[PDB]
Amino acid sequence: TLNGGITDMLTELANFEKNVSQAIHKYNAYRKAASVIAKYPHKIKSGAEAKKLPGVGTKIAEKIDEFLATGKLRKLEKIRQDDTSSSINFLTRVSGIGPSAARKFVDEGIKTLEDLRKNEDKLNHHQRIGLKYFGDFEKRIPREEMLQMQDIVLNEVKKVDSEYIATVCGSFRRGAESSGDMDVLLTHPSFTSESTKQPKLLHQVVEQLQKVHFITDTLSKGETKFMGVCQLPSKNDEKEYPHRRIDIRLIPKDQYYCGVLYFTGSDIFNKNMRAHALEKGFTINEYTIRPLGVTGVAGEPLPVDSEKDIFDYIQWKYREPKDRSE
DNA sequence: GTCGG
DNA sequence: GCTGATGCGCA
DNA sequence: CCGACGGCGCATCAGC
Ligand SMILES: [Cl-]
Ligand SMILES: [Cl-]
Ligand SMILES: [Cl-]
Ligand SMILES: [Cl-]
Ligand SMILES: [Cl-]
Ligand SMILES: [Mg+2]
Ligand SMILES: [Mg+2]
Ligand SMILES: [Mg+2]
Ligand code: NA
Ligand code: NA
Structure with missing residues (x-):
């Protein structure tokens, strides 16, 4: 891919900063740079050119000049040797x-x-x-396997209560040919921003998926979020499918659009969407978009009837999930 | 590490 | 038990 | 030129 050398180098440095230096803001800066560079439609041919992009400053431009001149970065050679x-x-x-x-x-x-x-x-x-x-x-998970996984989850949920709605989000919603894991957004009419008149709504779904042996292990579990492991069933004498990570979020039904926006991502797109919102006077989470008050504090939730409504408030043109990927 | 207050 | 902070994680 | 950078769920620990 175009500029793939550079976005690899930067991704590698980001990982070093987060995992080794514990410098989480350098991690974010390298990821923002890699991201803007990846969507840049021309072959980068100097650091001075790259520097004109937002999120590429002097130090990344120097790194780009070394990599372009030499095909490597000495900083990364030393990290790799340590x-x-x-x-x-x-x-x-x-x-x-x-x-x-x-x-x-x-x-x-x-x-x-x-x-x-x-x-x-x-x-x-x-x-x-x-x-x-x-x-x-x-x-990774082939989209073919994701489809079988979606089929089991949607089926087992339907059995618990036909009023649940389950939406597979993350890279899968964005149209990826493969996924890192499965992310399931869940809603039910009895759980809204106004109250919770049925307990154990997420727990009911989890235990049903355990009963049928789809969900095999639990990493963490609360009232609104489940993080665990699952596995497709395989045929006799066939190698088993790999165990897979699964996340399930239960979101208030009336907040579904903020929920599905958040859970569809990608992560960098969400962070850039929320930053833009901030510079347009709003704050966005998975529940709501709210106007920012002058004290800094957020106001009451704004009405939302679609994902596009959230895009409209911050004056972005609607991006389809396929265009939200890096 | 970058950029803006 | 709490509140606040940290660690690990989601997109 | 120093200090802010999306936003939050769950698990655990510190100091009450
Ligand atoms: Cl940092
Ligand atoms: Cl290198
Ligand atoms: Cl469990
Ligand atoms: Cl909403
Ligand atoms: Cl909120
Ligand atoms: Mg995913
Ligand atoms: Mg996930
Ligand atoms: Mg992820
Ligand atoms: Na720049
Ligand atoms: Na890890």
Whole structure:
């Protein structure tokens, strides 16, 4: 892809800053730069050219000049040669191990997959599941499998209560040929911004998906959000499907459009949409869009009847989910 | 790391 | 138990 | 030129 060398380099640096340096704002700056560069319709041929883009400053331009001149970046060559950095970065790939736990682990001599299995006693439940399924969670999901997964979830939900509506969001909604995981937005008429006259609405769905053995493990679970593991059924003598990450959010029914916008993403698109909203005088979350008061405080929710309504308020033209990807 | 207050 | 902060995570 | 940068759910810990 166009400018793929550069957006790789920057993505790699972003990961280093988040996972090793624990410099989350440099992570964000590198990701914003990579993002704007990726949508730039011309081959970048200098740092001075790239610098004109929003989110590319002096230091990224210097890096782009080195990479363009040489085909590499010495900064990234040193990071790659540092075994400690590589170990720390690697352990963050385990679900439940973030940058702080990876460093502690590496500080205690736990550097490899082998080391983590010998030291299961130091891992919490989430981390144990992330380890057990490590290879499986590194794989993407063909859209073909996502369709089978959607079919099971929509079916089992319908059985619990035909009034539930479940929408598969994330990269799948955006039209991706493969997905990292499955994200399911759930609504039910008894859960609104006004009140909750039925308990256990998310719990009912989760336990039904457990009863039929689709959901296999739980990483975390509250009233509105479920994070776990699932698996498609396979045929006799066939290799098993990989276990897959699944997220389910229950959103108030009257807030469905803010919900589905948030959950459709991508993440960078959401952050750029919310930042733009901020500079247009609004604040957006998965529940509401509200006008910003002069005290800084947000006002009451604005009426929303579609995703496009949210785009209209901030004076963006409507982007279809397919155009919300990086 | 970038950009704006 | 709380509030507030941190860690890990979602898009 | 120093300090803000989307926004929040769940799990856990600190200091009450
Ligand atoms: Cl930072
Ligand atoms: Cl390189
Ligand atoms: Cl559970
Ligand atoms: Cl809404
Ligand atoms: Cl809200
Ligand atoms: Mg996803
Ligand atoms: Mg997900
Ligand atoms: Mg993600
Ligand atoms: Na710039
Ligand atoms: Na991780």
